[PDB]
Amino acid sequence: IIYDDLSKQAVAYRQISLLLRRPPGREAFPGDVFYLHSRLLERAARVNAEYVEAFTKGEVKGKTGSLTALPIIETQAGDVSAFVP
């Protein structure tokens, strides 16, 4: 999976949060902006054979599965120390 401009996802969620009148944080992003990306990216995982066997109710036995994520971020002036980056 490739997520293009996760920085655009963060800008959209900032707009939603400020119109819903929820308290602003640094660079006006809401307090839980880390929780937005972290719970997204932690889903990209490799899972063991016993999880796949349990999930499929044993119709698949020998295989692991995986989801690999390539997120994209755009820095403004090589400033990697901006909040979302």
């Binding site: 307090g31 839980d32 880390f34 929780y35 719970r39 120390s81």
Partner: protein, 460 residues
């Protein structure tokens, strides 16, 4: 009987109304049915009119207004003691491994006062780690806070497993590891490497994953610290590993922003200095026993003046720097002896012999790093017969800082060594006084103590 009802749900922040004569105290734990699982809520504020304000210790999705709320009258309470060793838990003290229920004997509340002035110990004592570089150049106190500043590739976790092993075997202590915002992949790797090493029985692991809501990642440090306060009371001396003290700070910033307190300089929470003190002051040496802590540190922009470093540095006793440049030499542990420091390294604390030895090594390795410039810019011809002697000794000093770890045996294929503080002082004092000058420099690498370097030189 449940007595509250939910009245707002705004993300992770949940407001509950109670009858006026029943309002929860601060930090009390509530629970609710989020459909088919119980969700815990921790109380942050008592507002007017019986309304209380809480952070959800789990997913907030699927909560309705008007759900019933059970007021557990204690704080969050976690299992403690021997039954915790080798088990992985979440912040609530629930097992995250599949390995069944924890055979708890007690549950302790995670929120506690630090030891009072009369309970604190009346001594300053070094925790002998058995590791030559650390014991000489960056000595730990009992009750000390230690910062690890190295990056990745540098042996950081293998160093953690060696400390865990020596404190369990060569002392009689135990360890707790608190994963403050781990990567779930790295938490899985670390658990298997502790099984493969066989140090897993020695240490208890509390893990707060990043995918967790901010309240979980903030409080998980206090759960680990509470299990360490149990072991200490038994009379043991204990190690507490905090896997990133920076993420504890950021979790406090996220929670206080969700609460909507006014932010502070550089945007941190206004409570920043107290929240660090609330953790760090519990980690001390008491007459009964001590907790010593090793904390990974991150510097927000390599800016050392930023409030998170500046607050953390006020609590550290020692700083240990791991560098890839030394790992390139194959020297392990890859600890930089010139940038690592320890405030305990004072004559009145370690004594004059130790102080003079460590100052000697520091001055020789500083000088060698100067002469390496001359050897490059001008070559070895330029170098005097006294300057050749400090180069010849610094190479022997540098290698004698190497040591084989019991947990590294699958890499080195050589059995581990533990070196007492007196022996390491005697070895480096030896080389500096110019006895042992005549051995090959490879007689010192990975050997152990100096008594084994003379055995190695006899056959090398």
């Amino acid at each position: 009987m449940a007595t509250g009802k939910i009245v707002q749900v705004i993300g992770a922040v949940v407001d509950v109304e109670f009858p006026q004569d029943a309002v929860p105290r601060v930090y009390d734990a509530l629970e609710v049915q989020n459909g088919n699982e119980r969700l815990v809520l921790e109380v942050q504020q008592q507002l007017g009119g019986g309304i209380v304000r809480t952070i959800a210790m789990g997913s907030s999705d699927g909560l309705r207004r008007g759900l019933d709320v059970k007021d557990l009258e204690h704080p969050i309470e976690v299992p403690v003691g021997k039954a915790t060793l080798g088990r992985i838990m979440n912040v609530l003290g629930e097992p995250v491994d599949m390995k069944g229920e924890i055979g708890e004997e007690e549950r302790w509340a995670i929120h506690r006062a630090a030891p009072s002035y009369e309970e604190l110990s009346n001594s300053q004592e070094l925790l002998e780690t058995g590791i030559k570089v650390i014991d000489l150049m960056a000595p730990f106190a009992k009750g000390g806070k230690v910062g690890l500043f190295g990056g990745a590739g540098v042996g950081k976790t293998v160093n953690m497993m060696e400390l865990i092993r020596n404190i369990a075997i060569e002392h009689s202590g135990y360890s707790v590891f608190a994963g403050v915002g781990e990567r779930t992949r790295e938490g899985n790797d670390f658990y298997h490497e502790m099984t493969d090493s066989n140090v897993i029985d020695k240490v208890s692991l509390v893990y707060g994953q990043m995918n967790e809501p901010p309240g979980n990642r903030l409080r998980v440090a206090l759960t680990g610290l509470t299990m360490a306060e149990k072991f200490r009371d038994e009379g043991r001396d204990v190690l507490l590993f905090v896997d990133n003290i920076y993420r504890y700070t950021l979790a406090g910033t996220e929670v206080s922003a969700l609460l909507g307190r006014m932010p502070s300089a550089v945007g941190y929470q206004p409570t920043l200095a107290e929240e660090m003190g609330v953790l760090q002051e519990r980690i001390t040496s008491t007459k009964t026993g001590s907790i010593t802590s090793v904390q990974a540190v991150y510097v927000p922009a390599d800016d050392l003046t930023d409030p998170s470093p500046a607050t953390t540095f006020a609590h550290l006793d020692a700083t240990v720097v791991l560098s890839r440049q030394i790992a390139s030499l194959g020297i392990y542990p890859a600890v930089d002896p010139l940038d690592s420091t320890s405030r305990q390294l004072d004559p009145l604390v370690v004594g004059q012999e130790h102080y003079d030895t460590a100052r000697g090594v520091q001055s020789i390795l500083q000088r060698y790093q100067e002469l390496k410039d001359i050897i490059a810019i001008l070559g070895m011809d330029e170098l005097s017969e006294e300057d050749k002697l400090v180069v010849a000794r610094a190479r022997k000093i540098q290698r004698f800082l190497s040591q084989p770890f019991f947990v590294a045996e699958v890499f080195t294929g050589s059995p581990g060594k533990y070196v007492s503080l007196k022996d390491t002082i005697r070895g480096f004092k030896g080389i500096m006084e110019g006895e042992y000058d005549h051995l090959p420099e490879q007689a010192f690498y990975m050997v152990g103590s100096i008594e084994e370097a003379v055995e190695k030189a006899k056959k090398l």
